[PDB]
Structures are given as C-alpha cells and as structure tokens.
Amino acid sequence: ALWQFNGMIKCKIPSSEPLLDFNNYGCYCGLGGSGTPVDDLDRCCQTHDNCYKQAKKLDSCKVLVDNPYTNNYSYSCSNNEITCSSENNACEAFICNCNRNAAICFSKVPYNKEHKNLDKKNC
Amino acid sequence: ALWQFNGMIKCKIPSSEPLLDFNNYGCYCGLGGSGTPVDDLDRCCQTHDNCYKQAKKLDSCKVLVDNPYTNNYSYSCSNNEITCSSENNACEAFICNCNRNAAICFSKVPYNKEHKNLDKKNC
Numbered sequence: 001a002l003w004q005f006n007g008m009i010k011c012k013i014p015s016s017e018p019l020l021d022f023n024n025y026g027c028y029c030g031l032g033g034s035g036t037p038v039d040d041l042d043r044c045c046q047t048h049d050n051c052y053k054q055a056k057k058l059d060s061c062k063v064l065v066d067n068p069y070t071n072n073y074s075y076s077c078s079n080n081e082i083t084c085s086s087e088n089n090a091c092e093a094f095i096c097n098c099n100r101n102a103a104i105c106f107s108k109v110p111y112n113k114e115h116k117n118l119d120k121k122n123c
Numbered sequence: 124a125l126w127q128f129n130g131m132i133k134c135k136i137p138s139s140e141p142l143l144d145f146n147n148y149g150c151y152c153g154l155g156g157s158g159t160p161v162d163d164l165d166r167c168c169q170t171h172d173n174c175y176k177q178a179k180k181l182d183s184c185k186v187l188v189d190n191p192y193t194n195n196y197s198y199s200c201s202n203n204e205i206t207c208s209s210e211n212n213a214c215e216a217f218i219c220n221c222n223r224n225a226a227i228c229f230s231k232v233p234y235n236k237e238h239k240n241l242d243k244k245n246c
C-alpha cells in the first residue's frame with residue numbers, strides 16, 4: 001500500500017518525491033496523526049488516516065498481516081490519472097480508493113513549507 | 124509478468140482460468156513453442172513468444188534475474204480494459220505491452236478444444 005501510494009502521488013504530482021515531500025508534514029501526514037490539521041494538505045492526510053482506520057474494520061483486511069501500508073494492490077497511472085484495478089480484492093480495493101483519494105487531494109491543495117517537519121508540541 | 128498476464132487475460136475473458144485454459148494449447152501457448160501455429164489462438168501465443176524474445180534484447184530487461192514471466196509490472200483492469208502503467212520502467216512496460224496484446228488477441232480468436240493439450244508429435 002505505501003509504495004503504491006508513493007507511485008499514485010507521483011502520478012498526480014510528477015515533480016514530487018512523496019516519501020520526502022509529504023512525510024512528516026503537519027499533524028497527520030506520517031505515522032499517526034492527532035490534533036487539529038494545520039492546513040488543507042494536513043486535512044488530506046487526516047482523511048487518509050481515517051480511511052485506513054476504516055479499512056482495518058473490513059474482515060477482508062483483517063485476513064492479512066501487514067502494517068496498513070503493505071496491503072499491496074494494483075493500479076495504473078496513465079496520463080496522470082489513477083485507475084484502481086478490478087483485480088483487487090475487497091481490502092486492497094478499499095485501500096486503493098483511500099490512496100487514490102489522498103493522492104488527488106494532495107495535488108489540489110497548497111503545499112506549505114512552514115508545516116514541513118512541524119513541531120508536534122501541540123497538535 | 125506471469126500472474127499479471129493471467130490477470131490481464133481474465134480482464135478480457137472473465138469466465139476463464141487462463142493458467143488452465145490456455146496453457147499447453149497448440150504449439151506455442153506454454154513454455155517454448157516451435158513449428159507452425161495450429162490456429163489463430165496459437166498464432167496469438169506465437170506473437171507473444173516473439174514479443175518476449177524481443178524484450179530480452181533490451182538492456183533494461185537484462186538488468187534483471189527472472190524467468191521472463193517474473194518481470195512484474197503494474198497495470199489495471201477497469202471495465203474489462205487493460206491499462207499498462209506509466210510507473211513501469213522500460214523492460215516492464217515492454218512486457219506489459221506484450222501481455223496486453225496477447226490477452227486482447229486471445230479474447231478475439233476462436234478457442235478450439237481439439238488443440239488443447241495438442242500432441243507435440245509434429246509441431
């Protein structure tokens with residue numbers, strides 16, 4: 001799920017190294033997240049975290065071992081659009097949708113360098 | 124490359140178990156292939172074998188370990204159409220194209236049970 005989400009984000013933002021640009025941004029983008037999102041990018045991360053939390057409730061996802069970001073699915077990037085594959089079973093397809101949505105949200109919101117590596121001393 | 128081609132064929136032929144229906148069909152469909160194709164399905168297999176042979180000449184493919192059918196790429200099946208992903212590097216994208224083409228060829232040609240497990244005693 002993580003490398004596929006990395007690839008999805010580059011599908012939408014071809015200039016980005018997502019694992020570098022969006023990890024540890026604000027309160028939500030990265031491992032965990034808590035507190036009020038600092039901006040709309042952070043709010044895209046918040047929704048993605050909630051999406052993932054939702055996925056873990058599927059008995060389709062519970063049939064698996066992973067850190068949520070290792071539920072590997074199939075998607076294509078074609079002309080900068082993401083298509084989640086009908087080959088994904090239920091869990092993967094749900095995560096595929098979570099990841100497509102966040103990649104698109106990230107491409108539509110402002111990126112604020114101030115919130116990069118934001119001091120967690122109050123999220 | 125093999126499980127992705129399996130998935131591609133089911134994308135086009137949703138009633139099929141491709142690893143069962145198309146393996147060891149005619150002279151070409153399966154490991155190797157030699158002789159004159161027995162029918163157009165077999166000719167789709169012949170073209171796919173030649174495609175794979177072509178791929179091995181890419182220095183992009185030579186940078187890898189696999190049996191040709193383990194050059195794993197990314198594609199989506201959506202509404203029974205295959206899209207090879209812009210995330211594939213050169214070798215994978217070439218194999219993705221080989222596999223998409225054969226899956227489509229298979230869906231357009233007659234399937235002849237006579238040629239299933241055809242006696243190789245003259246291909």
Ligand SMILES: [Ca+2]
Nearest residue numbers: 028030032033
């Ligand atoms: Ca998070």
Ligand SMILES: [Ca+2]
Nearest residue numbers: 151153155156
């Ligand atoms: Ca063959």
